[PDB]
């Protein structure tokens, strides 16, 4: 196939699994997360069989949080949970262990799956003057998992769907992977032509989203549209140039250490390995990979770093604020902010998801419902990283932007 990565570094691929070893041993109910855990059983890389525990932590936990008795005695509350969108990829991480969901605990669980999707189809509602709560990229994540399962959707579900995409290339991504799933499996029939129409249009807006430099939207989107691309059914002319393209272009990144992130990885590895989530319908256990072991170095300088001296600004509410650091080279946002916190008037919150801390609340000012902070380097340029992620480079200006999407 043309879409798909056939030449790659092992030395490459072995450092991105390298990054994702230590996330093994970070078992805690925040830290459990099932898309490296997918990542990995999709990748060329196995990481000892410290995988096995994990999917049994999973397994533990994801059962112990979401089927929890009648009322809980107390609280309405005591401990948050894996959200819908999540047990969506926890069904992911069970395929990827060759294994479907199954008894009474994984029914009430295909259940509450099943309730996510048609709350957001109300939420949606009528005639589609409406948002998910979540979103279109969670709503076929939904789906997907559902699909990979043999679980069968409502047509009303799937409709809203439909009617998005027929009326963001990380959506287009995760929507097209969907209606791939459910073409295959024909799960539903009676719009089995609709259907294939669908991801003609997916297959159409990811191409006419290709930047100058190969990217499908950006670098990151990458990874992910090359997993619905390389499952074709349309080659082309147009087709083989852009998956040319954008496979070199994302080649070229890696040479730069520019996926840090362990999510971003795990959605990176399975497109080396000539895998995407629709692999899931029938997945490979017997097929080797190769075992990643600990590094167990990181090279001590004993030297004295670079500082970089930051300017950190808050906007989007009253009032604006900003601050003055100065910290060592290769100091992430988050430390920055962590720094700006504690040795200033700066106060900000996050919480856990699988991309890692995702900023809820600065300044005592929580996003609220179609809200959210927005992260940017000034002049205008949105960030392609997390707090944790994006290291800031010197003199930069980094603006926490509060914006309604
Ligand atoms: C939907 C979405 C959003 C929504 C989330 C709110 C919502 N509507 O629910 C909005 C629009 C707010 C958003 C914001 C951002 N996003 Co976003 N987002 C996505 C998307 C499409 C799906 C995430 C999702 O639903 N995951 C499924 C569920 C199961 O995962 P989850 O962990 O439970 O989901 C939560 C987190 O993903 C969190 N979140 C969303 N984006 C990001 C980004 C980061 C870095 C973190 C830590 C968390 C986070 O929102 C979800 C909770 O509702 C992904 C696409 C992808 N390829 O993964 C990008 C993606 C994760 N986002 C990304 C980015 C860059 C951002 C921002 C940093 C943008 C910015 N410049 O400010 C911010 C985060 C800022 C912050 N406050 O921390 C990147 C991450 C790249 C990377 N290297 O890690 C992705 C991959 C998109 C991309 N291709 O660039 N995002
Ligand atoms: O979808 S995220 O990049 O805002
Ligand atoms: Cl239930
Ligand atoms: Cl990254
Ligand atoms: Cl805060």
Redesign the pocket.
């Known amino acids: 196939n043309i879409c798909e990565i056939t030449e790659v570094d092992s030395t490459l691929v072995e450092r991105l699994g390298q990054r994702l070893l230590p996330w093994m041993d970070r078992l805690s109910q925040e830290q459990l997360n099932p898309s490296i855990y997918v990542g990995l059983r999709l990748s060329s890389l196995q990481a000892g069989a410290k995988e096995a525990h994990y999917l049994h932590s999973l397994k533990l936990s994801y059962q112990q949080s979401l089927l929890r008795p009648a009322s809980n005695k107390d609280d309405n509350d005591s401990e948050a949970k894996p ?1 819908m ?2 047990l ?2 926890y069904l992911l991480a069970l395929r990827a262990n060759c294994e479907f969901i199954g008894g009474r605990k994984g029914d009430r669980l295909v259940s509450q799956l099943k309730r996510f999707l048609e709350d957001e189809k109300r939420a949606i509602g009528h005639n589609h003057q409406g948002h998910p709560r ?2 279109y ?2 709503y076929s ?1 939904g789906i997907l998992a559902l699909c990979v399962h043999q679980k069968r959707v409502h047509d009303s579900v799937v409709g809203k769907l439909l009617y998005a995409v027929e009326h963001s ?3 287009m991504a995760m929507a097209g992977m969907a209606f791939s799933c459910l073409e295959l499996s024909n799960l539903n029939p009676k719009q089995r032509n609709r259907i294939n129409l669908a991801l003609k249009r997916v297959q159409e807006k990811i191409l006419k989203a290709q930047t100058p430099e190969g990217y499908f ?2 670098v ?2 990458t990874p ?1 549209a090359l997993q619905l691309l390389m499952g074709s059914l349309r080659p082309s002319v147009e087709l083989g140039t852009a998956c040319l393209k954008a496979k070199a272009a994302l080649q070229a990144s890696l040479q730069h250490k520019t996926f ?2 362990p ?2 990885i795990s ?1 990176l590895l399975p497109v080396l390995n000539q895998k995407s989530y629709v692999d899931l319908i029938s997945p490979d256990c017997q097929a080797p990979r190769a075992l990643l072991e600990p590094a167990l170095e990181t090279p001590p300088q004993a030297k004295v770093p670079k500082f970089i001296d930051v300017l950190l600004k808050v906007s989007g509410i009253s009032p604006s604020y900003r601050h003055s650091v100065s910290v060592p080279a290769g100091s992430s946002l988050e430390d920055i902010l962590k720094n700006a916190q504690e040795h200033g008037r700066f106060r900000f919150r ?1 919480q856990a ?8 609340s600065v300044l005592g000012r929580k996003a609220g419902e179609r809200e ?5 380097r000034d002049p205008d340029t ?8 994006y290291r800031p480079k010197d003199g930069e200006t980094i603006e926490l932007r509060l914006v309604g ?1």
């Open positions: 959200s969108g999540q969506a990829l979540t979103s990229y969670q994540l290339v990380d959506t939207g950006n990151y989107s992910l840090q992130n999510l971003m959605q996050t998801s699988l991309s890692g801390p995702f900023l809820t959210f902070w927005q992260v940017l949105p960030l392609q990283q997390g707090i944790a992620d999407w």
